[PDB]
Amino acid sequence: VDPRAKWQPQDNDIQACDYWRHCSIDGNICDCSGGSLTNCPPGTKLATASWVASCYNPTDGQSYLIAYRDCCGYNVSGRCPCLNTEGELPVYRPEFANDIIWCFGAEDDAMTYHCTISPIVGKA
Secondary structure: OHHHOOOOEEOOOOOOEEHHOOOOOEEHHHHOOOOOOOOOOOOOOOHHHHHHHEEEEOOOOEEEEEEEEEEOOOOOOOOOOOOOOOOOOOOOOHOOOOOOOOOOOOHHHHEEEEEOOOOOEEEO
16 A cells, blocks of 8 residues: 555564565565575575665564575565565665575575565664
8 A cells, every 4th residue: 555655564464565574575475485484485495695674673663684585496486475675775785785686505506586584683
């Protein structure tokens, strides 16, 4: 609703695109295809790479640094797709660029995009 409205995180449903940790997610939630909010689904490869974002936790009033690591080596899940860009910068500032395939580091050289996890990597 109103794709152009200020982002408004919630902290009650991790499979929804307004869940506080997905503030800078681009792709699909791993929780919808066998993974978890922070683990990859069976069969995929965990990347070492990621894009980060600092997202507001409405529940505690704090901000944490989210490292969006992708689970790869599989075709896109197709379930629970999101595209949030809270504080996303141009490609020339990769650390915060979310159109990039952040599969670097996955075993076996997996570079195909399946889904993205939202683990917290630290405050603020």
